[PDB]
Design a protein around this nucleic acid. Structure first.
Ligand SMILES: Nc1ncnc2c1ncn2[C@@H]1O[C@H](COP(=O)(O)OP(=O)(O)OP(=O)(O)O)[C@@H](O)[C@H]1O
Ligand SMILES: Nc1ncnc2c1ncn2[C@@H]1O[C@H](COP(=O)(O)OP(=O)(O)O)[C@@H](O)[C@H]1O
Ligand SMILES: Nc1ncnc2c1ncn2[C@@H]1O[C@H](COP(=O)(O)OP(=O)(O)O)[C@@H](O)[C@H]1O
Lengths: 359, 559, 333
DNA sequence: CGTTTTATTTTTTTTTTTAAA
């Protein structure tokens, strides 16, 4: 995809490899192959190779220092100024989407989606989990897909793809019926290539009444078996998701329940724990921030907000936080009961369907 | 081979001389045990083998099969020398190993051929069990009869869906079994094997297409079952037959949270029944249970049924529609070769259960099968080549979801969740979960797991409750129910007050007896009655209009 | 002529005679087999060991030299012999673990006079042979199950089978009808042990005997078949009563979708419609409207007239019957 | 101057198409 032509498609080509090169390949990566094209002695063409070149030794904002490992997070000396000074959050609200403007809640909330979740040390009787179900809606002509597209540049396994096109067989493979190799290879797919990754998708809207068969699995079961003419096994969902439906005439007219403002399926709004909508208003002084930002959008000199936190130092510091594993005997953690209680005092009014899945 | 001299000595000096673990070594006795069970699978453990002499790991792999010859000759020469009595019957032998090191799938490669191996697998579809040929004979003119045989079945294994390398493809391998190690494979189990690696005798050796068609094949010397889902008595016979057990068992019934002490009583009864008692001249009558609750999205109607999966003598689980099929279309067209068509799982675990969420979601043509099991103890394949049936001595349970939302009030339950009525005519047991306003400290403590009945027997007591004690009786005082019929047909007359029947107490009849299944009573009094009524008294009051006191004064005297 | 089972007999038990017992399933027809015939080329009765293909000797040969290799052997069946076949079939017991496992079975083989003897839904004891059909050394050698027959011995299960294969009982019959007390007496018999229809059960006296299919000189064949009804709520023993009625002439009984509108020798079988067990047999069933409306035309053809026909393929079964129904109910109010 | 030739069927998933109060 670094190479992409007009008209033509990433056509397919086929290859073998050796023992030490073998089974050391994963989802969408950038390696350096060897150009030893070779014939078929049937003819037709083939090719061959012998060499590939696809975080203990450190990421960007470093030079070598010490850590738990060699340089896995070694550069605390420079991170830590940007670790604790809690206004750094505002860099993570400001110095990350300077070319973009919307609500300031998403731009202060997504980060933990990108970052590891819970991963605790408890039962075998049942799993506990880290990540969360997620959404975003509004109506178009509000810049509600810039961000998803950007993630594909921002973050790993930010597989920005459409959902409009996909089938229910988008996810795994479906069938073979001749000796392709062994007459039963139906273990190819689309999702579990999330190698510690997420699959956020567009156009969740006109989608079918079968996708939920996978999303029902999302945060409890995370397992993968098929009722085909093959076999059944299972796999581990590593992944969260994004929501990409939309309304009919758009506005979620504030006279009917927000469930009923689209009125989609039964359990979907049980599992998705935050929706985080931006809905339209008409107060044009709102709008006159925008174009006067795009005053430097084409005018090529510093055509955004001045930054304070590069992409690469951001991306490196993501890891430092994922190997600490907090320990919660928090008395305030015991006074969440009062927090949740005064919450439900607010839930008592405006009488949605609420429970511990939101806890 | 003069080497062959010493090896059998090192066996012969080892099978009938060795002692370990403070005498009467198994090898003195396993053979005769085998001989008394006519088994031909006398076992060795490599750990003991290396405890004596580890030299048998390093002259083995130049050909382990000749090692096995050098094993069987010794064994044979022990049995018929010591049991020449045996010299009549089968009079052939091989042995087993259980190098007890777990090694893994997806590692056998170029350098793992035909050598000392130790591996696992997980089993799925394969064929029947059939025979082969064995011997070198055919000639006389200057043979296809009297030519000894040996059974055969094909395998298929699969690998752990737990220890997977994260989106690496689940894999597959073709492997063999043989006659004596046969008729133990079934779908969906794992089995640990000694294992040994080769290819076909000749897998397409020739100038060929742009890649050879080669396979790779294994068989077992030993198989040791890893799953073993059927088979310290001082607890049960003294503790598990009281009616205090509806605290003791209820102490350990649902170790998740305190909530909803009713169903502790319920599940304290739910696995605890089943009865034939077919009458004379009429038919076979009834021995089924039939249960459901209407939950809520946020309740526990998904996480509703889990714990009993592992424990029961029989259990068969299915989440409901979403991926439910109709296979749950048989012209009497027996499954011809490479043609496969399937049929209903109700008879499998006949006298077991169907564990269900999304019950109300499934397809009516499957519901046809699901219904009459519970009504006429039979069901009817519909106008195919055969109009066959499927035997139903079994039980029905589920975990459905409401209709059109979350939950309906004391307003009737057909509209609380949209089943049918004539399916519900055969339904037995009920409970309901709503909540208004300890646990939070519980939930956070349970989220801080940094890391009464015994657990490793508790089935065989319920086997005893499903096995042992089975009295019956005449009308003790249940003529009382001519009021519960007539009065509450007519006092609770017109709000929601039809659902009172003899099947409303045939339901009771199934479990009033079962108090003695719990207790090993050998009789029944009004003691077990009133507790059964405490269940009807409590389940029923929710299934009637918000005139709710209609049960309370009317029956809490019978509490 | 000590019985056995199917999961007990294998490689050891080959070329050997056995006693076991099972339950018939279905089987094929009666085709063919001979013992000998001959060929023009030599004209010898082609002696056979077992019930090869004339190697190199031709015998259109001794004509001088002029030779005739590679079989001028037109097999001449006008000289032949002739035998039968059925290829018979069994299912194992309902007692030997088909529950957590699958019920296995095998195929059988007969010879001459023992066909036209056995049909499905029967219970058998047998003696055969464990023999073979294939050859060998199939990733190595998987091969042949079957058996043949020698001398089966079937069962006589009790009191049911006045079906296929006294006058004191007529004295039993008639001295009760000598009494003119049957019309209302057997109004407490058809439910011989429980309550219902009591003073109105007299109306069955007409239906089981029926009226009379009194044909005419003119077109019509009148409605000797005539129909009756029941309808109501559950709890009245209405499920088990008609359950008994199958026990008390011949029919089938459930309601709706559950009767109701092969990979071998390229012939399309069609087992038929609803006069199968009901043409002399009659039925009594629930769920009329509780049933699909695609299979609710037939009732209108079945019932008021037996106006039967066929249209899947191009031929017309002109069927009829002396059959009838009752209806059962859980309809509205 | 001799000694040998030749066959495959059912199910998937897509894109087409089609059904009832
Ligand atoms: N706060 C904002 N920051 C940046 N751009 C904005 C903002 N508000 C509006 N815009 C501009 O308005 C345009 C809205 O049209 P746009 O191309 O986003 O449709 P879309 O949101 O992609 O539709 P959909 O999300 O349904 O596919 C965007 O191109 C965006 O540049
Ligand atoms: N009474 C209760 N007892 C224990 N856990 C509860 C109870 N009520 C709610 N929960 C919580 O609900 C969660 C499960 O919600 P869930 O069953 O998945 O909703 P759904 O059935 O719609 O998928 C559990 O993790 C559990 O902690
Ligand atoms: N008068 C009666 N005599 C005997 N049994 C009865 C009587 N009334 C009801 N029953 C009971 O009703 C049950 C059958 O109910 P059923 O007709 O199946 O209800 P439904 O028609 O709703 O399915 C029988 O098991 C029987 O015990």
């Amino acid at each position: 995809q670094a190479e992409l032509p007009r008209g033509c498609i990433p056509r397919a080509v086929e290859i073998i490899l050796r023992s030490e090169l073998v089974e050391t390949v994963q989802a969408g990566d950038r390696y350096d192959f060897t150009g030893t094209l070779i014939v078929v002695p049937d003819y037709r063409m083939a090719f061959l190779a012998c060499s590939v070149q696809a975080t203990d030794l450190p990421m960007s904002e470093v030079t070598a220092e010490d850590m738990k490992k060699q340089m896995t997070d070694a550069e605390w000396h420079k991170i830590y100024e940007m670790s604790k000074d809690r206004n750094l959050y505002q860099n993570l609200i400001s110095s990350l989407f300077p070319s973009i403007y919307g609500n300031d809640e998403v731009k202060r909330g997504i980060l933990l989606q990108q970052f590891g979740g819970v991963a605790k040390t408890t039962t075998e009787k049942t799993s506990l989990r880290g990540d969360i179900n997620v959404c975003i809606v509004g109506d178009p002509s509000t810049a509600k897909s810039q961000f998803l597209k950007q993630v594909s540049d921002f973050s790993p396994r930010a597989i920005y793809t459409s959902g409009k096109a996909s089938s229910a067989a988008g996810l795994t493979a479906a069938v073979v019926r001749d000796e392709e190799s062994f007459d039963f290879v139906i273990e190819a797919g689309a999702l579990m290539l999330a190698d510690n990754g997420i699959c956020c998708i567009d156009e969740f809207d006109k989608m079918d009444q079968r996708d939920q068969v996978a999303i029902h699995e999302a945060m409890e079961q995370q397992t993968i078996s098929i009722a085909r003419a093959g076999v059944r096994a299972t796999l581990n969902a590593r992944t969260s998701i994004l929501a990409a439906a939309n309304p009919i005439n758009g506005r979620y007219d504030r006279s009917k329940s927000l469930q009923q403002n689209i009125q989609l399926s039964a359990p979907i709004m049980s599992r998705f724990d935050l929706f985080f909508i931006l809905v339209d208003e008409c107060n044009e002084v709102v709008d006159y921030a925008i174009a006067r930002k795009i005053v430097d959008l084409h005018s090529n000199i510093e055509e955004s907000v001045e930054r304070a936190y590069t992409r690469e130092e951001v991306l490196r510091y993501v890891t430092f936080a994922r190997q600490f594993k907090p320990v919660i005997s928090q008395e305030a953690g015991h006074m969440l009961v009062e927090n949740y209680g005064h919450l439900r005092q607010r839930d008592t009014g405006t009488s949605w369907r609420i429970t511990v899945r939101q806890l | 081979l003069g080497p062959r001299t010493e090896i059998a000595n090192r066996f012969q000096s080892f099978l009938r001389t060795f002692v370990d673990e403070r005498g009467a070594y198994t090898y003195r006795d396993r053979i005769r045990r085998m001989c008394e069970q006519n088994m031909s699978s006398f076992v060795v453990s490599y750990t003991d083998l290396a405890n004596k002499e580890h030299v048998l790991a390093y002259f083995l792999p130049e050909a382990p099969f000749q090692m096995l010859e050098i094993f069987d000759k010794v064994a044979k020469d022990m049995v018929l020398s010591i049991f020449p009595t045996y010299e009549r019957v089968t009079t052939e032998i091989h042995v087993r190993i259980s190098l007890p090191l777990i090694e893994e799938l997806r590692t056998f490669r170029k350098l793992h051929l035909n050598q000392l191996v130790r591996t696992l697998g997980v089993v799925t579809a394969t064929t029947g069990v059939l025979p082969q040929l064995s011997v070198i004979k055919y000639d006389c003119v200057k043979n296809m009869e009297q030519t000894l045989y040996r059974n055969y079945q094909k395998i298929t294994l699969q690998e752990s869906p737990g220890r997977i390398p994260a989106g690496r493809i689940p894999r597959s391998k073709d492997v063999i079994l043989l006659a004596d190690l046969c008729d133990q494979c079934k779908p969906g189990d794992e089995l640990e094997v000694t294992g040994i690696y080769t290819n076909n005798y000749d897998g397409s050796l020739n100038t060929d297409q742009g890649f050879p068609v080669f396979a790779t094949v294994i068989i077992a010397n030993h198989v040791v079952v890893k799953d073993s889902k059927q088979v310290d008595i001082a607890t049960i016979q003294k503790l598990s037959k009281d009616p205090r057990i509806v605290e003791r068992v209820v102490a350990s019934m649902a170790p998740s949270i305190y909530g909803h002490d009713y169903i502790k009583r319920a599940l304290a009864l739910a696995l605890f029944g089943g009865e034939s008692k077919n009458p004379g001249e009429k038919h076979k009558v009834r021995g089924d249970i039939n249960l459901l609750i209407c939950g809520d999205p946020g309740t526990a109607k998904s996480q509703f049924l889990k714990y009993t999966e592992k424990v029961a003598p029989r259990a068969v689980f299915t989440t409901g529609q979403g991926a439910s099929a109709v296979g749950l279309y048989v012209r009497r067209n027996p499954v011809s070769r490479e043609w496969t068509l399937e049929a209903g799982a109700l008879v499998l675990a006949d006298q077991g259960v169907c564990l269900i969420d999304e019950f109300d979601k499934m397809n009516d043509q499957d519901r046809t099968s699901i219904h009459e099991a519970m009504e006429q103890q039979s069901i009817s394949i519909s106008k195919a080549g055969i109009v066959t049936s499927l035997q139903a001595r079994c039980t029905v349970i589920a975990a459905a979801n409401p209709i059109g939302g979350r939950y309906d009030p004391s307003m009737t339950f057909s509209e609380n969740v949209n089943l049918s009525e004539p399916i519900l005519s055969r339904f037995d047991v009920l409970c309901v979960v709503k909540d208004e306003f300890q646990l939070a400290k519980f939930v956070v403590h349970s989220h801080m797991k940094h890391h009464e009945i015994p657990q490793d027997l508790l089935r065989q007591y319920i086997v005893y409750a499903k096995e042992n004690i089975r009295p019956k009786l005449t009308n003790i005082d249940e003529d009382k129910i001519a009021k519960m019929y007539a009065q509450l047909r007519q006092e609770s007359f017109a709000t929601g007050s039809l659902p009172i029947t003899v099947r409303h107490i045939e339901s009771v009849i199934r479990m009033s007896e079962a108090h003695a299944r719990m207790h090993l009573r050998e009789n029944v009094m009004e003691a077990d009655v009133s507790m059964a009524i405490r269940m009807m008294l409590e389940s029923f009051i929710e299934a009637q209009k918000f005139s709710v006191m209609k049960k309370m004064r009317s029956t809490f005297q019978k509490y | 002529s000590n019985p056995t089972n199917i999961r007990q007999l294998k490689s050891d038990c080959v070329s050997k005679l056995v006693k076991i017992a099972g339950i018939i399933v279905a089987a094929s027809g009666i085709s063919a087999k001979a013992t000998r015939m001959s060929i023009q080329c030599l004209s010898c009765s082609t002696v056979i060991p077992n019930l090869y293909a004339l190697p190199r000797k031709c015998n259109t040969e001794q004509a001088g030299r002029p030779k005739c290799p590679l079989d001028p052997f037109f097999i001449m069946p006008d000289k032949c012999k002739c035998v039968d076949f059925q290829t018979l079939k069994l299912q194992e017991l309902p007692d030997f673990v088909p529950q957590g496992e699958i019920p296995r079975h095998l195929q059988l083989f007969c010879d001459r006079s023992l066909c036209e003897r056995v049909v499905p839904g029967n219970r058998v004891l047998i003696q055969g042979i464990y023999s073979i059909r294939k050859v060998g050394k199939a990733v190595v050698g998987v091969r042949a199950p079957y058996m043949r027959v020698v001398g089966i011995t079937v069962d006589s299960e009790g009191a049911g089978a006045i079906s296929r294969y006294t006058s004191d009982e007529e004295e039993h019959f008639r001295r009760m009808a000598a009494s003119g007390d049957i019309y209302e007496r057997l109004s407490q018999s058809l439910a011989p042990s429980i309550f219902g229809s009591r003073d109105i059960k007299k109306a069955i006296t007409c239906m089981l005997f029926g009226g009379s299919r009194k044909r005419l000189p003119d077109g019509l064949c009148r409605r000797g078949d005539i129909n009756v009804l029941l309808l109501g709520d559950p709890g009245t023993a209405k499920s088990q009563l008609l359950k008994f009625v199958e026990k008390v002439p011949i029919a089938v009984y459930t309601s709706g979708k559950g009767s109701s509108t092969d990979p071998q020798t390229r012939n399309f079988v069609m087992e038929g419609g609803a006069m199968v067990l009901a043409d002399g047999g009659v039925v009594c069933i629930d769920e009329f409207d509780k049933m699909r409306e695609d299979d609710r035309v037939a009732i209108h053809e079945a019932m008021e007239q037996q106006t039967i026909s066929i249209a899947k393929a191009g031929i017309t079964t002109t069927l009829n019957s002396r059959c009838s129904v009752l209806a059962a109910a859980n309809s509205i109010f």
